[model samples]
Target: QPSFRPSALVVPVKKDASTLQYVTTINQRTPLVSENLVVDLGGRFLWVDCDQNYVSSTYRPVRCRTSQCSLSGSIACGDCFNGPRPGCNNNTCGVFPENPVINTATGGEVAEDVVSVESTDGSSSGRVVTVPRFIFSCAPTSLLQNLASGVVGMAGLGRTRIALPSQFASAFSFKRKFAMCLSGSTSSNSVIIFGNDPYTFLPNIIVSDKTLTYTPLLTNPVSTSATSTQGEPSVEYFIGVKSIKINSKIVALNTSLLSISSAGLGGTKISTINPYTVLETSIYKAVTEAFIKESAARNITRVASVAPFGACFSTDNILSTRLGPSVPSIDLVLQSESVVWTITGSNSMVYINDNVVCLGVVDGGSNLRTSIVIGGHQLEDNLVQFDLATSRVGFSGTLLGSRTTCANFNFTS
Candidate 1:
């Protein structure tokens, strides 16, 4: 019997300064074109706009009746009214390419191409490996709007069979686990590592996966993507947020909104596409009110309300802590009271200028499917592990306290 071994695969992640989107580069096509794609936490499949210069010898369209189409759950047969191009094809399986940034969906054809990822020998970026005939979508150019400038498409890491992580795990017969350390700095680079390979940092700092705190990932009974089809299960990653606390005091909120119903009404979700954390109206009001009272007790100066942020504070006389500014801490008490994800002043406050700063969270208004959407800003510099095989998520409480960062991964050989 051959013993099973899971090799760590790494993909360098970058933050686009202009759009504030996390980007990853993948080698695609026969001649190997390095395509930059924005990370979509809940996107179902990778969809690239192959209209401009999609010259690849190994590109093949998945037929409507094939197993590939069946796996994607694509019911329609795609066809192009004009001539056939990479994005336009006849007798192909139809899939909806979602522009998550703009909240829009468009039609595209399911296609396959050669995809490559960098393998790690445990410590540094190692040799490149290929996943031939990897599933993807060749979308039109119009779907690129509102995304990061220069990004070719989206790299979907959603919980689906055809999503990047699942396919990568299956190809190598490894455990279905991956971790993302998204860099907050525009100039520095972070990484998304697959499997249980300890990434050692400069001088000899080891960040192991086993050290993270665990929370069971929940599922929305219905679809939550841009193309909402009844009875279709959502691929988004949802976690159980039992309650919220400001300065150790539980904030008053509607407890019913913390759980997702069969109709997929309310829950907490994580997203790399959303720039800031969004809270539903009533939940937003209660949480912010709690924060105000706590900060007032600490003698934090209050400033006029800023756009997008109802609460603003003057940084005058405020002391700086190693975790960030000296202010009340926000804790997301998950699954249980013992397992809490604390957001310090650095993650909770956004600097508008040298003098003014505001609470980073925004009001998402009512009618939102999810009660809380944890966005990119809060997730930055936090090493988050998404374990699909075990249906759990592991979070490394902010890296700042550890005196390291997401940018600490050793990139060179």
Candidate 2:
């Protein structure tokens, strides 16, 4: 197998500093920004620094009076000194933190311009994959300092006209598809592929004969005033989780709680952006009860409670200890029998201390709108593919086994 280190490519931002300077904008012509963007499949539009020189003639800002701006729910009114530019009018259109995906104070300014992704490989050298007339945002202030670092901005991979994948689909003439192979180790890197053949990117890992479980990607409607007029449902990726099984016993849970509202309000969502899985308090309680019961059944002794995690067990060392057979496997039963997601004991347990191991899943608390959120921790070491062309998601077991290191894998196009 060809070994390669997986990581994201850093890009540059260009813009004028005079009239367009927002609080977060830099005063240079071109400044290289460096920050790891949370690869969000739920985000709507791309957001960048408003003060960059890139926002000149090529940039087209959305007008506050336009239907697109009204539906955006992020519009603001600014001085009409620009005199109703070509595509926009007197009012300024922007977006804010509709949700906590990214922390921006004044939301973001919506605009479109040419963007490019520079190749990191030595062979590709200075070659840049440019997306012409790309729609995005130029936010003046952003609280995404923790989420986004020194450079450019975040990438939106959602099912929106302004998202990266949607733009790429039309720009490259490829299907609106993407995939991610997230490595579990912090030292190791992860990879995101933006084409139909996700397997090609992980050539050494995916077996030709392996049968991948496929499930339809459910859509949860976004309650936007724009949706009412546009007659189009603003949505996010949601899946039907039938039930959760601990070992051989099925945990009794309210099926309705796991389902989206009839009016398409809120429900469980699968997000790549979240670090861990979040289960609503009620569902989490049921799951914890079932886990405790099953642990007792296996003669495993329960230890003192961990602050956030209720159920914990005393262990000398989880790494050296052979707790696999004794630890119960958690299965997330999706749409049908063929679509079961088996969570091994190691994946379901977290090492709190040298002597304690607690359940990895956490409670969503009462404030969460969704009952369940499948995050990155649960997705680690697995090959997750979002095939937008087919409107389905495909899952395969760990491409690289637990013993394998992601840094050892080679990345290629």
What are the TM-scores, per candidate, against the unseen true structure? 0.96, 0.75
Which 10 consecutive residues of model 2 have the lowest summed lDDT?
19-28
Off by over 4 Å in 1: 1-6
1-413 per-residue lDDT for model 1 (tens digits): 54233387888899998898999988999899999999998999888998888988889989899999987776579778877767777899988989888998888899999998888765688777788889988788889998888889999999988888888888777778888888788987888888765666554666676678899989999888888677988899999998999999999888788889999899999999988899999999998888888888888777898988987888886688888888899999997889998999878888889898889899999878999999988998788889998999988878888888888887742
| Consecutive 10-residue window with the lowest summed lDDT within model 1 | 1-10
Error of 1 at 376 (Å): 0.5
In model 2, how large is the Cα lDDT of residue 74? 41
The residue-level lDDT of candidate 2 at 159 comes to 73
Question: Residue 102's C-alpha lDDT in candidate 1?
Answer: 90
What lDDT would candidate 1 get against the real structure? 0.86
